[PDB]
Amino acid sequence: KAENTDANFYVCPPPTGATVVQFEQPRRCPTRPEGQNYTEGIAVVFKENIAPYKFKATMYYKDVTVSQVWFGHRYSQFMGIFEDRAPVPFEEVIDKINAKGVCRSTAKYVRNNLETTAFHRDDHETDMELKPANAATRTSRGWHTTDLKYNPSRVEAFHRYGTTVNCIVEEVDARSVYPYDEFVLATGDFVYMSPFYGYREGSHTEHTSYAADRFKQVDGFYARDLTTKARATAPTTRNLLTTPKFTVAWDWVPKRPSVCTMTKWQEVDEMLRSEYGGSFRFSSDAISTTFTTNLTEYPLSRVDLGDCIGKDARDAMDRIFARRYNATHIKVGQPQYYLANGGFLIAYQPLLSNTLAELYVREHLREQSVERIKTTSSIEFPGLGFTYGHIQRHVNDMLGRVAIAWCELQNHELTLWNEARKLNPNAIASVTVGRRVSARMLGDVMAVSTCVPVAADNVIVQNSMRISSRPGACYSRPLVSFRYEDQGPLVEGQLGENNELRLTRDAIEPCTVGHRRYFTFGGGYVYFEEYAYSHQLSRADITTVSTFIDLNITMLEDHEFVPLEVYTRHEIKDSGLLDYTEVQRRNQLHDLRFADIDTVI
Amino acid sequence: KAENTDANFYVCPPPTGATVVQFEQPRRCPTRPEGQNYTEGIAVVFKENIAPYKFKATMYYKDVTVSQVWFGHRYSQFMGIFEDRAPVPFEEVIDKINAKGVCRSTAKYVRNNLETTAFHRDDHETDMELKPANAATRTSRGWHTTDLKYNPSRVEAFHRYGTTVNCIVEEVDARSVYPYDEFVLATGDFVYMSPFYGYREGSHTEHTSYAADRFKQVDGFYARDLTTKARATAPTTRNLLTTPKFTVAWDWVPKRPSVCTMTKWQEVDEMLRSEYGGSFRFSSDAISTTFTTNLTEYPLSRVDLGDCIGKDARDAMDRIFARRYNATHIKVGQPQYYLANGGFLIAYQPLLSNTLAELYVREHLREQSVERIKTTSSIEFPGLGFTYGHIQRHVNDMLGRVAIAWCELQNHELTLWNEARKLNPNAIASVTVGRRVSARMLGDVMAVSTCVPVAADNVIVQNSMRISSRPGACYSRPLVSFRYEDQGPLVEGQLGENNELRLTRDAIEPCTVGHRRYFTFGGGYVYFEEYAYSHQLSRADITTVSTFIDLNITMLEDHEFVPLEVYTRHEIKDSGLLDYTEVQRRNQLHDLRFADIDTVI
Amino acid sequence: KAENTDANFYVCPPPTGATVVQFEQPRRCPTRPEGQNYTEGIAVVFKENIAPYKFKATMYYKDVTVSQVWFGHRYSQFMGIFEDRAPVPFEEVIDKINAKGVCRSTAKYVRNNLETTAFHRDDHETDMELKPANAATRTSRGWHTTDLKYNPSRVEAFHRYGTTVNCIVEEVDARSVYPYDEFVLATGDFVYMSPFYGYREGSHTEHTSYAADRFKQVDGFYARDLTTKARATAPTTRNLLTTPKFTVAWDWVPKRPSVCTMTKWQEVDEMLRSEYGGSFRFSSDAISTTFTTNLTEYPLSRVDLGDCIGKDARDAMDRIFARRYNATHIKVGQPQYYLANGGFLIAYQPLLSNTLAELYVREHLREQSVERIKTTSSIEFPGLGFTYGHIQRHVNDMLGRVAIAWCELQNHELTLWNEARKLNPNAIASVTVGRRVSARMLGDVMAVSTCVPVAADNVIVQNSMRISSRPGACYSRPLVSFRYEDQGPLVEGQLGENNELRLTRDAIEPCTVGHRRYFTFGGGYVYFEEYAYSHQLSRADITTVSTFIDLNITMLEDHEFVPLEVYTRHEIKDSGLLDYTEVQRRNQLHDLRFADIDTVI
Ligand SMILES: *[C@@H]1O[C@H](CO)[C@@H](O[C@@H]2O[C@H](CO)[C@@H](O)[C@H](O)[C@H]2NC(C)=O)[C@H](O)[C@H]1NC(C)=O
Ligand SMILES: *[C@@H]1O[C@H](CO)[C@@H](O[C@@H]2O[C@H](CO)[C@@H](O)[C@H](O)[C@H]2NC(C)=O)[C@H](O)[C@H]1NC(C)=O
Ligand SMILES: *[C@@H]1O[C@H](CO)[C@@H](O[C@@H]2O[C@H](CO)[C@@H](O)[C@H](O)[C@H]2NC(C)=O)[C@H](O)[C@H]1NC(C)=O
Ligand SMILES: *[C@@H]1O[C@H](CO)[C@@H](O)[C@H](O)[C@H]1NC(C)=O
Ligand SMILES: *[C@@H]1O[C@H](CO)[C@@H](O)[C@H](O)[C@H]1NC(C)=O
Ligand SMILES: *[C@@H]1O[C@H](CO)[C@@H](O)[C@H](O)[C@H]1NC(C)=O
Ligand SMILES: OC[C@@H](O)[C@@H](O)CO
Ligand SMILES: OC[C@@H](O)[C@@H](O)CO
Ligand SMILES: OC[C@@H](O)[C@@H](O)CO
Ligand SMILES: [Cl-]
Ligand SMILES: [Cl-]
Ligand SMILES: [Cl-]
């Protein structure tokens, strides 16, 4: 019997030829795709402009205080203070200040539908000098005639008034937003006129909310710098609006050049555009993002106040070609404007290498074939897509190759399986149908028929290989006997390879000197020597070597991506030093907290 | 000797059988995983609502100015102006304005704990018409009785007063935020009462900061549209609060339906939920994001003011099933509410295809088994995860297959290595232990023993293949001699394949007509013809063909992802036209820059 | 002829040896890279601090109203109201309030360069108690002496004045921002002095905009809590500034400890740093991001007001090592400060496992070898990179292995192709040059020459395999005849494998009992039996089995990533309850809409 039992035994009566099989012919090998095709190009990306129009301006006004004081024993108490900003007449600004840097000590102005007027100190008019405002960090420039408050001189038990008239001139930045038909200052003072209003060009159509005479425009003007007392070298066109409280002056410039609904966001040297099922796809190596567009360009006409765009994109695409392509490529058609999801305007100039110059004609043809645009705040998804495509591309290429390389090999080896099939039809067959079988070749095809199992506790090997029947020669393979069923009548046979029990004992070789062999037998072997038995063996007790070329794949583990913000939207909010809402709220609770708004006395 | 030296020589005395080896049996092939399992479902995603409650309102008030003017030679100067908004009595609004669109030319009100009163022009009471405010772009509607300022008539050297009383009515939008117990206007005016205060329902418990009589509620009210002079068709419940400065009117509505702590963010047709180690995972193809939850639903109870959620999610999930599933699937249980990291509430309806209807019973069971929620600002990580999983999944699948396909092949080919082993035990062996060796088969296993190296500058081939010893036949393989060591005694042998030096010269074939052969010999060959020598050869000088199926892997290069923002947080800030902080800062520096706050006179 | 035509016929006259070929020797197998190398380490990430300095403060002031009323028949009308906040003298706050929680019913102060003064009710001075402000939700604490407005008693036709003097004390939060040289309150009131001004330490150099006597500092002060009337247990250094309108008090603390330009953003247990072409790369498993730095550390010196950084990072890195490494590793050098793109300061402590302790000496050496930093708002790209690298790494590893495993196999199998080549030189050859050819072995190389095509409509098989010429034996392969060209003279031959037409009919086997075979013949077979014809066959009509190990690669589909925001930048804006710009705009339009700013009367 068999020490080792980790195995099975079969009997393989040659197939008649009732069952035949053929080998699958070489399959059609997959073909590498002609390719996903790109278009070299330069690009300039445009985000909706969210910056206000910014420009310096200068105000001139006069703060007028009128106080009344009661005079008594020991003390003086204010009975009332009336403050006010008075706007400066056009002529004064010119003929005084920009003339001689001085101001009247009298304010004459309209207030509440009466022409009021005010004398500093109530003394008669005096031109006073303009001396700078007291020093303040992070302020533009101011100037002021006085810095004291004139109160009525003390006469007992007799109330009276003091007019003081401080002439104030400030330089202030001025901001405004689309559609640029009014602007504001740094004082909080609104001014309800376009910044580009005027007489010159079409400006007159620009918006105004004021009476016609509150605006002047000294064409050809020269500024006298209050501090330096230097006149202006080059003349401006100077705008001057007199609102109920002040006069603001500034230089006029044309609208169209001065503003734009969009901003040049990013400049891309190499911007590769593809078309992915009728949608366009520009991706940058640098910015690592990838945008998606329609196959039609976008009409700048439809863009209100988009002058800069053309001017800006062009200026940069040309600057780029010089630094990097003066030898290198060819401009296929004029620049083209696309609008990627997320509302990012895209200026693209399709290119074409130098060496391969011949194709201008080809693509040029293809390269030839209002409102407010909003831009998302996040470049996230363009990044994702970029990242996903590149990895997708690569992976899908390589594995694709592995597919074919594989197939090429499957078809290759058939040439061996053929010849191998002729050598051991038994084994080759059984490895091909994943079960043990008997087999035979009928010319070009394989006759096969099944193989019968035999209980491993039913197999018996005979001790010698020497043949009493005919001496000199020996059975080349050990002798055995076995039963199919337990109580079944014993059968006689010769051992084969892989526990194949051959019924006929014909496998014979001449007795050679010092013969010593091992044979597959159950879960292990059995050893022989000089044609006589010795012992069995564990498969383990013999040096094992492998035909298997190793490769171990490991999985790429799951990862978890907990959401994480750099700054929480409130953190940002809280960077607001003063909170307007918080203050008005607080301010407007005062009476409710500290006095009585109900009780009539 | 040998022209070509890029090689080595060995001598392979047949192994006795001291060393034996076996072939590694077929390994256990990896098994494809039963799979990661999804659950079809529809979904509606909810971000924390950050919008204030918005609603129209109408104010009615009266600006009262009282000026005093001094009369002198040549001029008039204001000695003081006192402005004020006076709130309108409940009855006036009703019995005048909403009655007949007119207003008294007198204001009677409480101010500073005295019932002051004011006569426009000081002439006695007059009802005056309500004429629209002068035109202003981007304003709601106003109306006003007068538009002039009445100043006291000129009498010389005699001061006096003018009461003017402008009746003003405005429609204004009104905003408020959680917890909705006070609201504000577009005038900046705070009103410290819930918007949902009233007598009806439980509203009375809503917050108030005012005396009880400053509120009225004309149940069943009809608005008379000041401009059109058309009465209101359907009645409202109308709220009217009289703050110290004005009366604001609006229609009352119930709270619960009127507001929600959350907003319906996104509607997802196909939302696939998985469970990944006891955590849930819903991912959308469309939005390309993937969220992570606990395995337990979220109790809407815990959500304060979350009425809409249920109402909204339900409304859409049902609308969806119609457009896309009226034939297609089956609702497993009622909708379920999950809360993904990032605080995104998720309404999910687990589904199940039509064809496979049989499983309701199975999952339904499983589908059965306060506070303020904050939502992050960025959908970044849900996107990342989404992107990572999908690529992970795919890759890990394919390579997984490559692993098995490979293994299947390693086990396959052993069937050839077997039969091949019997044919050239020498070569097969040496390729299996990665070093040259001699070998032999002892039945089912391989007897092996080593092979000895011989200096390439020590090998000598004999010129003829014809045998003086026995003529007619020829050595089938060229004759050689060689020494092991330099000064070692020469040895005689016959050449084999791959520079194998056979000690016995027994390899013999009959001299055939016009014989011509090449033999492996050193870094190249040596050519023969008619059994006599001719010359050697470079391996290179002969047409080479390959058995190698090609595949070339390329690496996917590193990429760098420079951080890039669309808009810098300051860019956003700067989109604030007026900056409150900048202005108050500037405003509150005035005195410090332009006057003196120290010097007592 | 041949029923099946899906095939071709060839004739293969043995090559003379004019054309010979060799097999490509084993190629050099790729070598796995020694590896990308990491450095274990702990980390703490720092975002630019955007929070203002926050600290409690307490103001003390006095609102002074002076009203005049006209007395007439039936009524009283205000002729004017003058309101004002008056600042409290240093002594009062101390010697009254913090002493005895009471206040004078008189205000004495400087206003407009006159020392005005005010008597509550005009009755003489009275100390009055400080009673809390009326209750208001979400306010800090106030207190006030009175809550009524005193108006002049009614005498007919005689105007007069009422001075009322409400003493108010508030606790208010106070905020300020870099460079911390002035701060603000919750009242909107600016205070133009550093919060850290004082006499102690170097503070005196801190900024001031006020006269020197408006500041006091009671070193060693004890607060009396107005409500509880409990004195303060521990003494403060108390700052008190008297601005023109109020006095604000607060405790002084040193600057350096009290503020920091940066904030501890994130704490990373395992932070792996690599160097990628001379740029550093720290990536976290947890936060799933990966940052990029230069190979040089960053000098904290260059960081203005960065005291906390050192203090904070150190404190946490040490806390971490305890929880997780008290046994585990070794601190290679002191902490190191790097600044990753996006301006994220990085505190890193390079570590080294315990078991492998021997390398301190090695890396320690390497670990040894002002301004305002801005931090981007988005952690996007660090995430991308993180995600991309990890997938890149993995993929590039595995496929890399597949490359080698493959190559190892290509070189392996040559050992079979060799022996196989000797068995069927015909077939092996033709599969190696991808076209049918005749072949032969000249020792160690392959003699080859071409094979000739023959029209499939030109091949004829002869019916018996029995040989009239010599009986007993049979042609082992069916007999045929064929022409090369149509009208060409017929040729005689024997069939071979794969439609090989052998010109000589020498393939012969003894007639065996009950012979039955199939032969490859055109697009199918032809069957034989007992050496006589029977019929042909379709390839399809026979059981086919495959030698091909299957593997199917599928592509990972394109995905589209539509841009998607959680909250649109305006949605955020609109979360601003009151909009300052909207209000001032609206407020400053008033006159334009409701009165006349032109018409002089
Ligand atoms: C690109 O062109 C397509 C049609 O040619 C536009 O597609 C529509 O886009 C709007 C958004 O503005 C969607 O709401 C519609 O449902 C889309 N229609 C369809 C059927 O797809 C698209 O507007 C163009 N893209 C841009 C950025 O302008
Ligand atoms: C999901 O359930 C788990 C517990 O079942 C919760 O886990 C905790 O989440 C908080 C954040 O709110 C962490 O600070 C705790 O450390 C977590 N505990 C543990 C041990 O994991 C979690 O709160 C639930 N998720 C949501 C979104 O509610
Ligand atoms: C890292 O060091 C490099 C040089 O060693 C710096 O590179 C420059 O960075 C600035 C941005 O501040 C770029 O505008 C320059 O073009 C860069 N020079 C070059 C040639 O690369 C870099 O500033 C350092 N990084 C940090 C975050 O400080
Ligand atoms: C042209 O290209 C070369 C390339 O090095 C460069 O030196 C030069 O700046 C470029 N000049 C032009 C024409 O812009
Ligand atoms: C039902 O589904 C079909 C599918 O085409 C569609 O035409 C129809 O709108 C759907 N109707 C319902 C019941 O919603
Ligand atoms: C030391 O490490 C062990 C590990 O379990 C832990 O129990 C303990 O908290 C750590 N103690 C120290 C020294 O921090
Ligand atoms: O001093 C604070 C005061 O000006 C505000 O509460 C008015 O609303
Ligand atoms: O004109 C500017 C003036 O109103 C402010 O500076 C007051 O603070
Ligand atoms: O009542 C609104 C009024 O205070 C503002 O329009 C002033 O600008
Ligand atoms: Cl891409
Ligand atoms: Cl996923
Ligand atoms: Cl990484």
DSSP A29-85: PP---S----B-EEEEEEEE--PPEEEEEEEEEEEEEEEEEEE-SS-EEEEEEE--E
Q: Helix, strand or coil for residue B251?
A: strand
Q: What is the 3-state secondary structure (H, E, C) of C450-482?
A: ECEEECHHHEEEECECECCCCCCEEECCCEEEE
Structure tokens belonging to residue A574: 């809280």
Q: Are strands B106-111 and B114-119 parallel, antiparallel or unpaired?
A: antiparallel
CB distance from C401 to chain A under 8 Å? yes
A384 contacts C147? CB cut-off 8 A: no
| Tokens at A6, concatenated | 């980790």
Q: Which residues, 6 or more positions from A371, have their beta carbon under 8 angstroms from its beta carbon?
A: A302, A303, A304
Query: Whole-angstrom Cα distance, residue C87 to residue B580?
Result: 25
Q: Is the dihedral of CA B457, B458, B463, B464 positive or negative?
A: negative
Has domain B15-37+376-451 been given CATH number 3.40.120.10? no
Q: What is the resolution of this structure in A?
A: 3.1
How far, in whole angstroms, is CA A41 from its chain's centroid? 20
Are C172 and C60 contacting, i.e. CB atoms less than 8 angstroms apart? no
C85 in Cβ contact with C290 (< 8 Å) = no
Reduced to 3 states (helix: H, G, I; strand: E, B; else coil), residue B10 is strand
Chain A nearest C-alpha distance from B138 (Å): 12
Question: Does residue C279 have its Cβ closer than 6 Å to ligand 3?
Answer: no
Please report all neighbours of A, defined by 3+ CB atom pairs within 8 A: B, C
d(CA C367, CA C41): 12
Domain boundaries, chain B: 1-14+452-543, 15-37+376-451, 38-51+258-375, 52-257, 544-601
Asked if residues A173 and A57 have their Cβ atoms less than 8 Å apart, the reply is yes
Using the beta-carbon criterion (under 8 Å), do B420 and C417 form an inter-chain contact? no
Q: Which one, of A573, A171, A136, lies nearest residue C181 by Cα?
A: A136
B76: three-class secondary structure by DSSP: strand
Contact at CB, A545 and B24, closer than 8 angstroms: yes
The CATH-assigned architecture of domain B38-51+258-375 is: Roll (2.30)
**How far is B444 from B429, CA to CA, in rounded Å?**
14
Q: Cβ–Cβ of C114/A21 closer than 8 Å?
A: no
Going from the Cα of B589 to the center of ligand 8, the distance in angstroms, rounded, reads: 8
Token representation of residue B520: 């492996």
Which among A184, A395, A574 has CB closest to C556?
A395
DSSP state for residue C115 in the 8-state scheme: E
Nearest to B266 by CA among B320, B328, B326, B330: B320
Helix axis angle, A380-423 to C425-432, nearest 10° = 170
Tokens 């490769």 found at: A551
Q: Atom 23 of ligand 2 has which residue's CA nearest to it?
A: B294
Tokens at residue C15, please?
């090559």
C141 touches chain A (CB under 8 A): no
Nearest CA in chain B to A135: B593
Both tokens of residue C395? Answer: 């993929």
Under an 8 A CB cutoff, do A420 and B420 touch?
yes
Measured in Å, how far apart are chain A's first and last C-alpha atoms? 125
Task: Say if A516 is an interface residue toward chain B (CB within 8 Å).
Answer: yes
Residue of A373, A597, A599 to mutate when probing chain B, most B C-beta within 10 A: A597
Choose the closest CB to C520 out of A75, A398, A444.
Answer: A444
Whole-number Cα distances in Å, A280 to A292, A343, A390: 6, 14, 16
Touching subunits for chain C (3+ Cβ pairs under 8 A): A, B
Q: Residue B286 C-alpha to ligand 5 middle, in angstroms?
A: 22
Q: Which residues contact B422 (CB under 8 A, 6 or more apart)?
A: B441
For C364, the 3-state DSSP assignment is helix
- CB of C68 within 8 Å of a chain A CB? The answer is yes
Round to whole Å and give the CA distance between A541 and A558. Answer: 42
Specify the 3-state DSSP secondary structure of C255. helix
**C551/A contact by beta carbon, under 8 A:** yes
Instruction: Give the CATH number of domain A1-14+452-543; options: 3.30.420.270, 2.30.30.1230, 3.40.1080.10, 2.70.98.10.
Output: 2.30.30.1230
Sign of CA dihedral C532, C534, C535, C538: negative
What are the backbone dihedrals phi and psi of residue B402, each rounded to the nearest 5 degrees, phi first? -60, -35
CA dist A246 and A252 (Å) reads 18
How far is B175 from C573, CA to CA, in rounded Å? 13
B379 exposed, middle or buried (CB, 10 Å; 0-12, 13-18, 19+)? buried
Q: What is the CA radius of gyration of chain B?
A: 51
Cα torsion for A571, A573, A576, A580, to the nearest 10°? -150
Beta strands in B417-476 (DSSP E): 437-441, 446-450, 452-454, 459-462, 473-475
The per-residue DSSP string of B474-514 comes to: EESS-EEEE-SSTTS--EEEEE-GGGEEESS---EEE--TT
Q: d(Cα A564, Cα C379) in Å, to the nearest integer?
A: 8
Pocket of ligand 9 contains residue C593 by CB under 6 Å: no
Which pair of tokens denotes residue C305? 């007001």
Please state, in angstroms and rounded to a whole number, the distance separating the CA atoms of residues B436 and B10. 8
C344, C46 Cβ separation under 8 angstroms:
yes
Longest pairwise C-alpha distance within chain C = 162
Interface test with A, best of C79, C560, C590 (most A CBs within 10 A): C560
Record: contact A82-B80, CB cut-off 8 A: yes
Which atom of ligand 8 lies closest to the CA of B587?
8
Instruction: Please state, in angstroms and as integers, the Cα–Cα distance from residue C353 to each residue in C38, C362, C367, C594, following that order.
Output: 13, 14, 16, 80
Integer Rg of chain A from CA: 51
Cα→Cα distances A311→A298, A318, A324, Å: 16, 11, 21
> Residue B63 and residue B166: Cα distance in Å, rounded?
5
Q: Alpha-carbon distance B50 to B374, whole Å? A: 10
Site of tokens 């199919």: A484
Token digits of residue C182 = 């002035």
Whether C487 contacts chain A with CB within 8 A: no
Give the pair of three-digit tokens for residue B438: 């001699």
Residue closest via CA to ligand 9's atom 6 equals: C587
Q: How far, CA to CA in Å, does A471 sit from each of A445, A466, A514, C323, C507?
A: 40, 7, 17, 84, 36
Neighbouring CB atoms inside 10 A of B58's CB total: 24
Q: Is the dihedral of CA A204, A207, A213, A214 positive or negative?
A: negative
- Rounded to the nearest 10 degrees, the angle between the axes of helix C380-423 and helix C425-432 is 150
Distance in angstroms between the alpha carbons of the first and the last residue of chain B: 125
Residue C322 Cα to ligand 6 middle (Å): 6
Calculate the alpha carbon distances from A332 to A266, A280, A361 in Å. 22, 17, 9
The residue in chain C having the minimum alpha-carbon distance to the alpha carbon of residue B586 is: C190
Position of tokens 């734009």? A260
Taking a contact as any Cβ pair under 8 Å apart, which residues of chain C between 233 and 272 contact chain A?
A: 265-266
- Name the nearest CA neighbour of C494 among C517, C509, C511, C476: C476
Among left, alpha and beta (phi > 0; psi -120 to 50; other), residue C514 is left
The alpha carbon of C60 and the centre of ligand 7 are apart by a number of angstroms equal to 12
Q: Give B550 Cα–ligand 3 centroid separation in angstroms.
A: 44
CB A308 within 8 A of CB A300: no
Relative to beta strand A53-71, strand A160-176 is antiparallel
The amino acid occupying position C182 is E
> Is C298 within 8 Å of C280 (Cβ atoms)?
no
Looking at all shown ligands, the one closest to residue A302's CA atom is 1
Q: How many helices (H) and strands (E) does chain B have?
A: 10, 37
- Residue A579 neighbours by CB under 8 Å, 6+ apart: A573
**Which one of A377, A411, A450 would you mutate to disrupt binding with C, by most C Cβ within 10 Å of its Cβ?**
A377
**Surface-to-core class of residue B348, CB atoms within 10 Å of its CB (0-12 exposed, 13-18 middle, 19+ buried):** buried
A544-601: which CATH topology? Answer: 6.10.250
Question: Solving technique for this entry?
Answer: X-ray
CA distance A524 to B313: 69
Closest alpha carbon within chain C to B422: C419
Query: Chain A: nearest CA to C497, how far in angstroms?
Result: 7
Residue pair A23/A513 in contact by the 8 Å Cβ criterion: no
